[PDB]
Symmetry: C5
Subunit: 345 residues, 5 copies
């Protein structure tokens, strides 16, 4: 038997009229290409750039009746990647590429197997820098959906139709983690069917779900800002007449609330709208600011001038024992309404 | 009928004298090319680099009378992107590229349809790193216009003329957001007509409008610096003779004003001229600095030495009750004139 | 004798039927390729990206019986790297490339020696950006394993089998250090044998071990946060009635604990889960926060109103001498359980 | 008349002996090439890297007597950029490239016009990453000169001579700004004439001048550090015996001077030598440090022990009223000598 | 005389049997190549990456007896860089490339002159990203040696031998500075002679010396941390009984020592071991921490309870006048031993 590298040059040569610029079943039914991807790497999810890079194996399967053979004995051939330009291949591309390239190290990472009845299996290795828009209106408590869609560039719906295969359309590698997200093990597979002023093009997409982990922002940002609000409240139990003690506890509590918020903006993303962590640090700044405005009333009622001196110091102690109950209670109402409206979403 | 890949090699081959180095209507009227772009991605608007990257579909339409055909039955052909060098194409380029590339993943993302009367439709996919100059003299309250212009490189105005088409010249994709701006849904389409010492070249441009979002700088920078100025004012209601209380409230208020301004410069852009957020933090530093210079007068008039001791402590209380009205009032005048002169622009 | 550049063009030319698209021993036993790498550079271990770049010499050895020669006298030939496409080479690739390239400066850095019995030695120089997942649950006290695996792309296990050689499979260059790790001088060499829906492909891997150095985080982060907890404890020896001294020592100790934690997050990695350095800074924040809640009880029991005044000031001194022993003792229990549970791992 | 694309293939074909590897006027006088650049973009002036990127149109004009024609009627031809290798072009390069590339988007951005007497006009579009050394010994008050030189690589001075043209040798685009500099509208045009151990090569250069803007460093760094030195001086007017007031005003003024200097190093460049802004923040730290050493003398003379108690408290008030004049006066002498020695440069 | 571009095609054509895949003096003595580099640019010395980029002219000189000519009159020819593949060139490469590329802007920056007796001069322009390991155990006081070695890839020592020339082997351009180092004007030139399991390959290297500048770390980090230790010592001269004055001077001195160390870690490199600047900031933290532990003893001995009250206050004044001498003296001993052990290295 003749070797398979020369049997393909007889099957696709100057004879038999095979042209790699003409789709199979030309002027007939469309070409049904079935696809599945295999994700090797995933991550570096940027929020300044709003993209994420991924490393996949793209497998494509179509039927080419011009490549059916019956003389050669073996059930499958394998075309070398140097001779790849002599095959009609689909013009799949990604609608949100934002940059992508092949892998060409030690061999072009390509693969092409032509079966006996003409089924063609074409697997390649691609690095993508896919773009997904992100909605950071509740930043530590958010789920980010990042799609991945696969259009056709030059053939319309009456010529070429993409499908996912019905047996494992998207697999993900096992030991694959992320620094700031987790990847849920459920994928949404649907169509999009892009229209233009050119024609109905085909496309298929796959959605992913990214639940952001929580435990860093509690230990570093929520719990330390929580304790500073508690330290604002020990002024109501410190003596009234200890005037350097109350205002030294006042501003130095709103200075460590300023340092806690300023030093943590370097770790946060730089979007220009208000988050959920931004309204925590703002309202917790308002409880520390309100503690010194309480003492500014106490240091003025009690200093105000026996009948009337007994009256005014009774009023400044009344405004103190009320606020021992009111400021933990009002802060507990905010601490309910905050976590309810951001866990329910 | 002969297949379309060989009908184009008869239409553009060694016969018929078609040369891809000669424009249509040579030594005649100019070539009218009509263009429209479709923006897929948009963002990473840098201010250190003063650029922005964008991902478009560039569609071009011209008429080539050498490519009119009448033997072949179908109304449109489609040239394969490998055979692209056998077509006269316009030398469009972007006058502010600053770097750009094509997309070549799984197929060269190109498209070329030759109609029956010779109308040629040429769509490609380009990633641009277009450069727009930015004017940050009022940084949180600003509108940034970033143009996008499309010159001709080697053909002058008497040979090649660019136009926008009169049916949707610039579309933008739907789910397309930005981290720090919003994109207004109105586009300005005009000419520029570049002159050189070479000749009148043609160009068309498209302007975009970028209103910067506000809500981050209020919650993180304006409102916290606002409250620190309020805490400077509780010293006028704290007792005069409480000398460690007044000056402990003094410097620790101008220390949390220093920390608020120093820790927020990391989030701001690094231009070397004065912004509108820079004059907020500077004038708000002058109100906290002025509160301790008030007490430096009070701690000197009252300490100055019955007739004359009653006189001087009456003067130090007079300078205190005036400033209880004056410092909220002067700060309210600045709070009017600031927001009027930066919302009117 | 004819020169070796023309003896290879006789050995691999149009005559003898040598085809570079057909593996040796075709339709026979598989091809046994034995491999060894030589690491020149190593480092830039990112944790945001979770990768590391490396610079190796990849040596491959296989036997090709089509390239055995006996007319030419010398024991070894050497094919020039321009004529490299006329040799069957294995399609080795790295399963976690994440980007890689060759070196082409002043010559393509390739090498190919064909021995007399057909043994082929193929050495190249590759820069890899290999991806390894990292587990930072105990950040200063951690060992990071980063693998390096070498699959086959198009030939299955019945056609091509990779091996390490039994004489020094992985060497590392001598003067090769890292900024944040040390590299242990022991390598684990094993198989992986990747399965797909395509076939059993071969792969070999090599594990490395990276013990993180310690001495920076002690001097910069553990010891300074240790001393701030000691300064919280000098309040129990300062007088009870010195009310501005106790609370000035209180908040300014929890302000320098806030500054110590905020200013050190810029040096730490930005994962979104809790580390071991994150629970040090959190629990050490709880001991400084607890010191002022101690004095809030002392300043309330002693102020509470001879028989009963002698009773209450005796109780506030009792709660002070207990806490002189209890807070160094409770902190020593945490200081045991922390370092035991993170040195035992 | 024959079309111009075939008239050039007759003018430069196998006939007439035109060789693109031989300069015009070979073994005769040198080739006089006249050059002018047109700057489109300018900026991203790095100081860590010490470079700046620029985007120019490089126009070159020389005379080639082999390309003179008289049969064809029109005064100018235009060679297509695909056929560019059939023309002798000068080997101009930039002596401080540090990286550069062409622009190849939608057409190679090249241009070549051969006049009737043989004058050749060759315009291209280049992105350069030119390197200029910077001298930051007085950082906010500095002028940076960044040159741009254009050598010849393989032809010496007796073969090829570069010139600027005498009609606008360097133009700059109109709406072109910088984030941290301004560009003066005067250019210095001179020669350099590089010598080596190879031969006298030609080169021309063009200098630019970059005056750094001022207004950011005044508002953010000079004026806030100025006001902290003023707050050190209100201790001399606060009472002597107010011991917690004086030292609370002392260290908290040198703490807000520490925060002002530490938080502003992130915005400054990271050179490893002393600037002019570095000696401002250092000497202004010495005036705040000297204010507390003044009170350390006052709190020791007055505490030192009627005749002798009247003597020592008279001496501690004498050392206070002297320093009310001396510290504004000594700081004003530094405030003169500083701004004189950095505006005169 | 025939033109030189055709005389080289006669000297290296199909006739005369010249093969560019065979070294000169084949099966004879080795090839003596003499080399010298000319450094144009130098810098961006990274410490996270541990590399540095450089821009050189690499000149190589060897003798090829196949290229000797005597018919043509002129003493030197010059081969055009398009025809470069018809010359045996040495396979020099850099053993620590870590990435490198050529320069191809406006012409390939190459040069090749064949003398009359066959001496070949080959100069090219290369941008290298050479890797040098750095030892930051004493960070502001260190000398960094970064080598640059030039191996041979495919020819062993019995075939090809590199040498430096004996007339200026390494020159450096004149106006060439660095942001954080200075470059000493002395170069070490030596051999390395790499051995492998392949053969004895040749290599030559050149060492450079980089003394780090000092003046930034004194003004920004050493002197400000020096003055904070002095402010710890003014508590021994402030009154004993001024209890809010002593502890307000205590923690606020160790807070400005925390801010001085935290805010300066952003400018320092991120190695994970202890530097010399790291032990300065740590020991200077121990002197400020020790000043408050001194007063914690004074505030307990003097408060401890006429005979015995006179005894204990005499002991608390004794422990104060000792420490007025001891803490400047112990700090001066550390200030000797530190600068001796880091200037002697
Ligand atoms: C590609 O897939 C579609 C769906 O299987 C096929 O289209 C149908 O084919 C049957 C006959 O084979 C027709 O009766 C239907 O009218 C077709 N359309 C639809 C919507 O069902 C198509 O034949 C396939 N083409 C190829 C080459 O396999
Ligand atoms: C390209 O567009 C312009 C405008 O439609 C055309 O120029 C005019 O054409 C008419 C006749 O067709 C002339 O009467 C006018 O004098 C032309 N100039 C102007 C300013 O109106 C031009 O013909 C078009 N060329 C092609 C090939 O379509
Ligand atoms: C490649 O390596 C394997 C192992 O050495 C060889 O496979 C064995 O070869 C012997 C005879 O040579 C057989 O008896 C065994 O059945 C084979 N399999 C196993 C699992 O041991 C193989 O021959 C080698 N192929 C070449 C070309 O060298
Ligand atoms: C290139 O420019 C120089 C200067 O114009 C020319 O060199 C001079 O040419 C004249 C005659 O044309 C001689 O008398 C001079 O001796 C030349 N040298 C100098 C220094 O003036 C040169 O001829 C020009 N070459 C071409 C091809 O135009
Ligand atoms: C390359 O350089 C070496 C040293 O000059 C030469 O090797 C020596 O050549 C002489 C005769 O020319 C011999 O006697 C020596 O035995 C050689 N070896 C040593 C170590 O000295 C060599 O000839 C030169 N080769 C060429 C082509 O120039």
């Amino acid at each position: 038997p003749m070797p398979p590298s020369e049997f393909l040059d007889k099957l696709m040569g100057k004879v038999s009229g095979y042209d790699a610029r003409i789709r199979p079943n030309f002027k007939g039914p469309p070409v049904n290409v079935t696809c599945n991807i295999f994700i090797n790497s995933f991550g570096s999810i940027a929020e300044t750039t709003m993209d994420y890079r991924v490393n996949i194996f793209l497998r494509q399967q179509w039927n080419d009746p011009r490549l059916a053979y019956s003389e050669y004995p073996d059930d499958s051939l394998d075309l070398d990647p140097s001779m790849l330009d002599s095959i009609w291949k689909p013009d799949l591309f990604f609608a949100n590429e934002k940059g992508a390239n092949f892998h060409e190290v030690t061999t072009d990472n390509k693969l092409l197997r032509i079966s006996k009845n003409g089924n063609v299996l074409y697997s390649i290795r691609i690095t993508l820098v896919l773009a997904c828009p992100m909605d950071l209106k509740n930043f530590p408590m958010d789920v980010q959906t990042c799609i991945m869609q696969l259009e056709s560039f030059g053939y319309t719906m009456n010529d070429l139709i993409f499908e996912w295969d019905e047996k494992g359309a998207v697999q993900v590698a096992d030991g694959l983690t992320l620094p700031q997200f987790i990847l849920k093990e459920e994928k949404d597979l649907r169509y999009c069917t892009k229209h233009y002023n050119t024609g109905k093009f085909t496309c298929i997409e796959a959605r992913f779900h990214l639940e952001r982990q929580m435990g860093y922002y509690l230990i570093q940002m929520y719990i330390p800002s929580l304790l500073i609000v508690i330290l604002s409240w020990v002024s109501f139990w410190i003596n009234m007449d200890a005037a350097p003690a109350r205002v030294g506890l006042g501003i130095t509590t709103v200075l460590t609330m300023t340092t806690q918020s300023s030093g943590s903006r370097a770790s946060l993303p730089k979007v220009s709208y208000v988050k959920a962590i931004d309204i925590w640090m703002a309202v917790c700044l308002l409880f520390v600011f309100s503690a010194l405005l309480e003492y500014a009333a106490v240091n003025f009622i009690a200093r105000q001038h026996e009948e009337m001196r007994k009256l005014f110091i009774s009023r400044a102690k009344r405004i103190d024992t009320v606020s021992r109950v009111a400021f933990p209670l009002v802060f507990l109402i905010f601490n309910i309404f905050y976590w309810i409206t951001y866990k329910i979403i």
